[PDB]
Amino acid sequence: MEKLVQPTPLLLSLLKSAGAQKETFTMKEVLYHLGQYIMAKQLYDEKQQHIVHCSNDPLGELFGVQEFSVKEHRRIYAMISRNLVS
Ligand SMILES: CC1=N[C@@H](c2ccc(Cl)cc2)[C@@H](c2ccc(Cl)cc2)N1
């Protein structure tokens, strides 16, 4: 069975605002809901669509960055892990 992870309060609140309805998730599920949030908030750069703008959004504080690239996967996993229960 795939390992389930447990978002801490702020990430959990974001995930549920995006439609999530449980407390533990596979990493694939966490990433899915985050992608939905980013899409819904229109955070992608208009010309460089790999870039997510966080400087005007609470996601910036959650991840601790101003922009990130969807192509930097290790970085994204790290930003999520800081928001998972150890
Ligand atoms: C969950 C997801 N599906 C893709 C998509 C792509 C286009 C559309 Cl219309 C819907 C979903 C992608 C996306 C969303 C927005 C942008 Cl700017 C770039 C990539 N995110």
Ligand SMILES: CC1=N[C@@H](c2ccc(Cl)cc2)[C@@H](c2ccc(Cl)cc2)N1
């Ligand atoms: C273009 C695209 N690829 C997916 C992905 C899936 C996994 C990873 Cl590590 C990167 C991009 C998804 C995404 C983007 C950003 C986040 Cl935070 C979550 C999901 N959007």
